[PDB]
Design a protein around this nucleic acid. Sequence first.
RNA 1: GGACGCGACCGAAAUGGUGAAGGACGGGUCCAGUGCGAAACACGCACUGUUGAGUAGAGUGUGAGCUCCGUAACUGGUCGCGUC
Lengths: 215, 225
Amino acid sequence: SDIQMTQSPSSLSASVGDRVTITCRASQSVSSAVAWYQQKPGKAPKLLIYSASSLYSGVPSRFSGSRSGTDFTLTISSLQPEDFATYYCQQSYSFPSTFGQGTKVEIKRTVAAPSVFIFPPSDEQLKSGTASVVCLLNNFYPREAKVQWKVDNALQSGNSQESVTEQDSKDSTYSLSSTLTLSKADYEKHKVYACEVTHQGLSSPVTKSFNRGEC
Amino acid sequence: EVQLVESGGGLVQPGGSLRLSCAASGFYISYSSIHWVRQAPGKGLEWVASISPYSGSTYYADSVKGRFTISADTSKNTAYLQMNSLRAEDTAVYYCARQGYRRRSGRGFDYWGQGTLVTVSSASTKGPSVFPLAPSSKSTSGGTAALGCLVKDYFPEPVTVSWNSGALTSGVHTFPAVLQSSGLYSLSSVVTVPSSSLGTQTYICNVNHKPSNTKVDKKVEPKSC
RNA sequence: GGACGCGACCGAAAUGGUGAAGGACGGGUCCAGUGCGAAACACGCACUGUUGAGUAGAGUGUGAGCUCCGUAACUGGUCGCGUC
Ligand SMILES: CC1=N/C(=C\c2cccc(Br)c2)C(=O)N1C
Ligand SMILES: [K+]
Ligand SMILES: [Mg+2]
């Protein structure tokens, strides 16, 4: 049987200076052959802990690891700004090797409502046969947000895609873009295009809209 | 001093083959175990394969067994990953890593390459169409205005976006690409600016898609209306 | 009485043959685990384990001891005989 490394939590929010612990639980004995890695967006993983509890050379001592049977924990005694990233456990007791699903550690901050913008498709794209409608949620927190598309007040479904940026390095907010995709023909059959945003920072739902022909 | 550089990544059709290279420097691979680990975009790390020192024993993840072959050329101080019968779900960044010296780092991987992107798809290489996200006729919502560029229908990853050749960086958000049902990627780059200088200030998005020789600059102005 | 001499019997270091014993007679080897050699496996070293291992050996030892049948050094013992 392949050895499972069940990691939790999958995500975690914390303040600078907080004490946090990440857990990986093996499906069978892996002795002490467990390593911990840190990974930041667009970068390779970096080794932090080996043999379950040994601090890799050059790694700050606020990082520690412990073993309790087949349960392994990575602890950061006091988070610093550069500590926010994704962490992976790994068993190397036997092949094949197994990584945990990882834990993303994000920074906490005060609730921030998003600024909402809607963009009608450009005339240049329209002469191509496709209409892309874009909605932007700019600099908000927390990450959880709900975007809905309405066409002539009809709720759209299955014809849009979302993308969210990494937590910002300065204000620690998120941004989100949603794109509604329509054929040029379907697009010209309707007038009012809107996206309704709901977010914790919003006193109430916010609707941004435009009328097709006007602008 | 220690360094690993992977290369050979790129676009390949399903059922196709592809050979990755892992060039070591600052150390000799003959004294170490060398590993391959991959990461599908937005996903976690997945161990792929390894080769042991002195014995040349090789091990493979179940998901790639019988398709992948790990090897090493000590004369070039380089390791390799031969990938056959490639599938869509093989799409990932491929890292090679050095298993450290047992006495100092146990079985931990103490050094990793920067990774090489492997895209398995039947889609053809294609430059993106860049469309303007024009600032609205209105001047509110945040005290400022928002604008950007829609980089649509390119393939494969990645693409780069800058604004005004890199002069404009503040308030910029370039979103992670999305894989459309067409098999093509699409993303947006937006920036918030003072609405009082929309017609005055110049805003150009700089889009570069190397795999297709597609380099484009699009000026974004308020629509005539 | 005792000494010398011969013989027999017993004893005996040594030694050839023999056949039971498995870990409380051992060594070798293998196996498991742990650590080390730039080393997870394979290779080598060190440590640990016999409620890890055949007394048909699976040994370029079946080695020691023992069971049982012989040869036997001689410092021994005993008895008989010869002589002093
Ligand atoms: C079967 C076997 N066992 C051996 C040795 C041994 C040593 C000590 C205790 C035990 Br049980 C067996 C051995 O060398 N073999 C071939
Ligand atoms: K033996
Ligand atoms: Mg060994």
